[PDB]
Amino acid sequence: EVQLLESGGGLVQPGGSLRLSCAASGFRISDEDMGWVRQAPGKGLEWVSSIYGPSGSTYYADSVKGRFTISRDNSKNTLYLQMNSLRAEDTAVYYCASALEPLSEPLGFWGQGTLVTVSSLEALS
Amino acid sequence: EVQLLESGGGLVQPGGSLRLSCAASGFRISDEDMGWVRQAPGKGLEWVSSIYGPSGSTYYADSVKGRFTISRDNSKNTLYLQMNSLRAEDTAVYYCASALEPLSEPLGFWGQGTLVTVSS
């Protein structure tokens, strides 16, 4: 029973920061290629970041390079996403997900999704 | 720039059929691994189907086994999703996905998405 439970989303002002968390149950995060996918209306889906090849190599989108940081905690079996210097363009629903071809399961699995919103004082008023 | 253009969505009656098409740009679907994701109203994204491996092996979710069929056409370089015996729960926004690994690690790509409404 592979399960990914997400946490950490919320409302933040530009320049703020969040730490998205995704706890896995049923398998070790130290063995799968994990990542984060953003979803926004009129934007489809895009891979934000990913950690792969338990040598531990990280991919980042050009939009989030230098600001986002993907991490693993094998003790707690949790994937982390540090999101500093947030922008209005980072507003979306983030999903922790496996690769298209998982090592454990024959088909990929997703998290439930966490809404992360970045809005300024002028946009809210 | 690798792109995935979806088409074929719309309204279908329960028990009907439909064929979602995804035209690829920047690569050949013959060598890559691809798949179909869907997002149901009030629910998160879910992997509908996939095709990967050197075997061309296909895999489906328990909800769509026997009813959905993923396939590739090298003639038009298009990924097809045949959906028969559509239920009301098949109403969703469908995206096509691909994985391209030119530098030893896969890179995920998605499409814009198309809406499929199984309504009476």
Residues of B with CB under 8 A from a CB of A: 33-35, 37, 39, 44-47, 50, 52-53, 59-61, 95, 97-99, 104-108, 110-113
Burial B43-65 (b: 16+ CB within 10 A, else e): eebbbbbbbbeeeeebbbbeebe
Name the DSSP letter for residue B67.
Answer: T
CA distance readout (Å), B31 to A16, A68, A81, B54: 42, 31, 31, 8
Q: Which residues contact A101 (CB under 8 A, 6 or more apart)?
A: A108, B33, B50, B52, B53, B99, B106
Return the structure tokens found at A91.
């507003």
The total of structural domains in chain A comes to 1
Gap from B59 CA to chain A (nearest CA, Å): 7
Resolution of the coordinates, Å: 2.7
Q: What CATH number has the domain bearing residue A75?
A: 2.60.40.10
Question: In angstroms, how far is the first alpha carbon of chain A from the final one?
Answer: 45
Is residue A42 in a domain? yes
* Short-list A22, A45, A109, A105, CA closest to B47: A109
Return the structure tokens found at B19.
């064929």
- Counting every residue written for chain B, the total comes to 120
**What 3-state class would DSSP assign to A90?**
helix
* Short-list B77, B63, B105, CA closest to A52: B105
- A45 touches A39 (CB < 8 A): yes
Closest chain B residue by Cα to residue A43:
B112
Q: Which domain range does residue A42 map to? A: 3-118
Query: How determined?
Result: X-ray
CA distance A78 to A22: 6
Beta carbons within 10 angstroms of residue A98's beta carbon: 25
Burial class (CB in 10 A: 0-12, 13-18, 19+), A23: middle
Is residue A125 in a domain? no
Would you call B110 and A57 a contact, using CB atoms and an 8 Å cutoff?
A: no
Burial class (CB in 10 A: 0-12, 13-18, 19+), B32: buried
Is residue A124 in a domain? no
How far, rounded to the nearest angstrom, does the alpha carbon of residue A37 sit from its chain's CA centroid? 6
- B34 touches B55 (CB < 8 A): no
Q: Which residues contact B86 (CB under 8 A, 6 or more apart)?
A: B12, B13, B14, B15, B16, B17, B18, B67, B116, B118
Is residue A9 in a domain? yes
Amino acid at B17: S
Name the DSSP letter for residue B90.
Answer: G
Angle at B111 between CA B108 and CA B114, to 5 degrees: 145
